[PDB]
């Protein structure tokens, strides 16, 4: 089984930079090579087949070269929508095999988050839990801290967050922290606060509401 | 237009059986070798199986030999993957792919379906509840909170796909209860909050949940 | 003496693939080649250098029955000097072929709802077959410029194709049972004679 060795396994680069990715086959495979692009939560799509033929649609920023054992994928001017994981596939012979992937991130200027807080809904309260959600929209870099405060008491153990992948237009991130309390506990308190720390803010931003408007 | 649509994914007991199906159109199906390739959550691409154009040859990666069997029906433009003795390592997104054209000798690009997720778990299916993330009190933010479902995936859209600018659908988080949760949010002009209608469409196939929640002020 | 066993040939439960066509040697028996034609359930009955109702007053050393399954649009190939995948890579009739070609539709025995993959034919070959040759090799076929190392891939295809007979195919893609009778007269005591 032909083994493929792809380098590097991740890289970051600025918009407009040239990005180069390489694949090394354990055997001659002449030109029987495809390059795939896989965007977040999508299926892999072929950019180049036969080592250097552009698939229809694919922007001409993309090109490939090599023959035998050493192949190269070039994005001549990295664009925001190029955030993806790239794979090489050997097509000489079954079992078909793949390189390990190359996560391509975009280097960007600093952007502060826009912060929103969201009280639990009328509906969910009837069920016996309360979910308090805090949104951090379109910031950069990824690092961020959310602290929950309930009547000024710092919460611990009762929040989970997740972050999106880099946005395909402005290369920023978004994050969503959710605080989970029982209906009883939630109603024992008035002030619900989301305190956000991020490199783009001079001082932590707090967004808050009072239970029951 | 080449189209490859997969189906039959979902929740399977550890040790049980599932049969995936790949429907194809836009090309003379019987001319092409086909393959199943799978991608585990967060991992890379693993090829597992191929069948030749006419069904006279087939083979399997080692992690799958003895347990899975590939087949095709050239009258129905359909590829199949029968999966037996499933286990935790088999949880993945399974893709079907059309590869070599024995009719010609020119290299053609492969074509892949969209994937289907099979989850090998003993836990029970469970449909989500959907709660609005009501907006403002300019650019306003609103959303939907899809809570307590199993297994993955859940899909969200906004205004039946009419609203796409400004959406962020977050990765599902796995709570201590063993159920997942997921939020989806949109940024929207403040003035449009009286005029324009905002609905989020949640669909959780493993429990046949399809819910539309109006997200509105107050 | 005894009767020739054409019933075993024509009414055999299993028929070979054409790439691996079966030859039976008919010997020491009395044959009514009319009673073969009289079973007028044959869509093809073409004879070469001979005729039914004349096979009954003729004696030969050996009679050969080659049998196999192909598809409807390939029957036309089971004839001398024909070209095509069957005539070139599976079963060639010589220029001096002397015998009859008898075929008939077998959709009721040889198709299956998911497709029957038991019946195969060779699609690729480096060289045309010679008359009455048989190639049962299974080596991967190099359709391109690079070797195949015993393994399928781009331009490296296992040569045998599956017919995949299904009952819903149009006639040209349905299975036909073929029997080719070849009559041979060596300088030796004849042992296959008509009743005459
Ligand atoms: C095949 O079987 C049928 C039905 O039993 C019979 O009538 C026919 O004569 C047989 N054919 C030969 C060649 O014996």
Residue numbers in the entry:
A (entry chain L): 1 to 213
B (entry chain H): 1 to 137, 143 to 223
C (entry chain R): 333 to 528
Tell me, in the authors' exact words, what the paper reports.
The antigenic drift of the SARS-CoV-2 RNA virus causes immune evasion through the accumulated mutations in the spike (S) protein, especially in the receptor binding domain (RBD), which reduces the effectiveness of antibodies elicited by vaccination or viral infection. Here, we analyzed broadly neutralizing antibodies isolated from long-term hospitalized convalescent patients of early SARS-CoV-2 strains.
T57S mutation in HC-CDR2 could contribute to reducing the steric hindrance with F490 of RBD and increasing affinity around E484. We detected multiple escape mutants from the culture with NCV1SG17 or NCV2SG53 and identified S494P mutation or E484D/G485D/G485R mutations, respectively. While NCV1SG17 and NCV2SG53 did not show neutralization of Beta and Omicron variants, those mAbs neutralized most of the other variants.
